[PDB]
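COMPLEX REQUEST
Ligand: potassium ion
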Amino acid sequence: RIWNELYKVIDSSDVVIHVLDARDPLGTRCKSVEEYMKKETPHKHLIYVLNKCDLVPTWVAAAWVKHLSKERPTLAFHASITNSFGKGSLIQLLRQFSQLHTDRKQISVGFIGYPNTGKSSIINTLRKKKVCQVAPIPGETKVWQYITLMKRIFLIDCPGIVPPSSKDSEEDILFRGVVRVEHVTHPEQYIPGVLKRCQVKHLERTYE
Amino acid sequence: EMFKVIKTGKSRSKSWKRMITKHTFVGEGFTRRPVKMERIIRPSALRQKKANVTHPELGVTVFLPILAVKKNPQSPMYTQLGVLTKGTIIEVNVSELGMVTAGGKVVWGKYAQVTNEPDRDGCVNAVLLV
Amino acid sequence: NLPVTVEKPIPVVYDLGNLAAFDSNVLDKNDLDSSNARREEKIKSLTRDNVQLLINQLLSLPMKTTTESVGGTGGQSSVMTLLQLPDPTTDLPREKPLPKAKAMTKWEKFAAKKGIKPKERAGKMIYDEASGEWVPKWGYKGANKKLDDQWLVEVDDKVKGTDNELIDPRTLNRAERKRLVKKNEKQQRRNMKN
Amino acid sequence: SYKSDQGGKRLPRIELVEIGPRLDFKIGRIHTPSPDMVTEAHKKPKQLEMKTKKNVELDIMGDKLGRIHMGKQDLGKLQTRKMKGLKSKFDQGT
Amino acid sequence: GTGKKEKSRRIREGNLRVKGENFYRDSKRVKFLNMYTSGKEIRNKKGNLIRAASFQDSTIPDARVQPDRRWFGNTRVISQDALQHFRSALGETQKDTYQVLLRRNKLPMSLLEEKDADESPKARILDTESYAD
Ligand SMILES: Nc1nc2c(ncn2[C@@H]2O[C@H](COP(=O)(O)OP(=O)(O)O)[C@@H](O)[C@H]2O)c(=O)[nH]1
Ligand SMILES: [K+]
Ligand SMILES: [Mg+2]
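STATUS: Structure written out below.
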């Protein structure tokens, strides 16, 4: 059902935005969908938006934008209805895409990526209104949703996707914010991964 | 037969969307129209890109990519929708057959006629028009 | 082995599309006046210098080569190498004004208003079902004129009560056809006047 | 044309031979055109050339391409989230 | 208000007008917005079909293809010079990350995608020696 929705939004989208987590962008990349888009639908324009850039240091976001721009146009972003970053840049980029496709009477921008990376949040930020449901629990978006940004620009919200892999373990999936922790059996066995991924001084400041 | 009525609305009270039940060729750079204004539906599973073309010369069949739909004998509307039924004239890429004109030009596009029913057998069969 | 490099105080400008070279240097009338014996040599030497520079530019132009043999359409054969002349720089007057657009006719405006897309014009052949033949729908041996040669026509009952009862239905159809054609011509003349 | 032996085999020495006619024209009289007639005679069609479109190009392979422009992304105007674990006031073991 | 009448509005700005054409919609707008209520069949008192639903007409067409010499000609040809041009150009293209593909040119890519390879595929052993042998 989710992958049927994803292929429907891709088939409907002229522009596709891949939303990445600024804390682990390569971990949140969907390389298989990028390959499929480059092979079967080369006329669709795929770009990167690096969301949650407020959760990393400034230079980390700058370096990630620099390294991802060698592959695709990348825009750093902080999603928020009231206090956002990058909203004007994203809007003027979509205006450029519309002006390129002036032959089409309207264009559609489909938002794809991992669950909980902030796709609904970015759409809400562009609208300046809570038009899409936002929650930290995965599977909050279950079907696609059309949002009119301007008369010539539509935005398509999509449910989150997780491409299957053999190298990625359950630990990696869990630390990418994909699963509901309340349904996992023994979380103490995943706590050492938290200690590995977090700085000790930061942990002791968070928990006193 | 060609179209299936698609009902919309919570109580299924609207009936303006139509779905094509036959196989289609949508061409390069196809993007679906937005769902609010999409009257004609051409689902992706029924879209074809390649055909089994039989050459009367040398009696060989090759799997060739479809370039265009030239003439659907049922209607010019089905021609412009790209419907592939029996007897449809298509344009095929004949590059791997190695044809040369009398002037030394390489032929890479010719016409073929669909000889089967792809809605019944799941594939497109065509005979080259030579 | 005289040189091919020509020195000029003011550079020559070129129009390689028209094969022209313009030099605006100082020309002294003492050597070009009719009272001089070296005027022809002077003119020839300056023309030689300008033509030499022009030839250097022409041979510096990019060149088109082909691989097709003789005997085909095109006029360039494999052994020939042609020069690619740029577009002419000098602007010259035209002999006639540009063709102005034809104004939109009454039919074209009606089609724009009523959403009538222009027809496909696939061909002029139609299938006549009573026979097994593809025949032209108009023109020489057209299907619009089969009624004139039809062996038997039933006289319509509406023709009764009139003075046109006794006339040939084929003649009536020919008159109607000519009336329609002349009306089309009159409409074209009206669109021409507008 | 002759071999020059100084410009190689690709650049020859040119010479001229007069053919005729040789004419000397004295400029008797002039009749210039009007400026509006000049503009009418020098109007170009523009119907045959492809129109120039901004940020649209045709590459060597014949693909139509469009260029986009990101603009400046100044990350110095972004305030990072002031998380509790980044505060020295909650220091332990001191 | 006589200036708010439909007749007066038209003169300020005969059989071609349609229902619902007003200050807010013209004829094309009216028919496009009637698409959303269009697709139903019409039946009378006795039940006969006054009009079929849109795209649901049941008349069987007489589907024929006429004889024509256009069917047997070449539709696309390419010259040797053009083949050499595109074969050389495919390889000298340098992709920019800020250029997007708006439209792809139509070319014989099987002819054009010919690359020199250092190694050959392995031979087919079943031609010389079958399983039974
Ligand atoms: N700090 C921070 N949190 C964010 C940002 N964007 C989204 N979030 C949070 O991440 C969670 C998931 O957001 P959501 O929009 O539902 O992600 P989606 O599954 O991709 O649609 C929400 O609780 C958001 O508040 C951001 O830019 N910064
Ligand atoms: K979510
Ligand atoms: Mg969501």
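REMARKS: The pocket of guanosine-5'-diphosphate (ligand 1) is lined by residues A 51-52, 54-55, 78-79, 115-121, 134-136, 140-141, 160; D 81 (CB under 6 Å). The CA atoms of residues 16 and 39 of chain B lie 7 Å apart.
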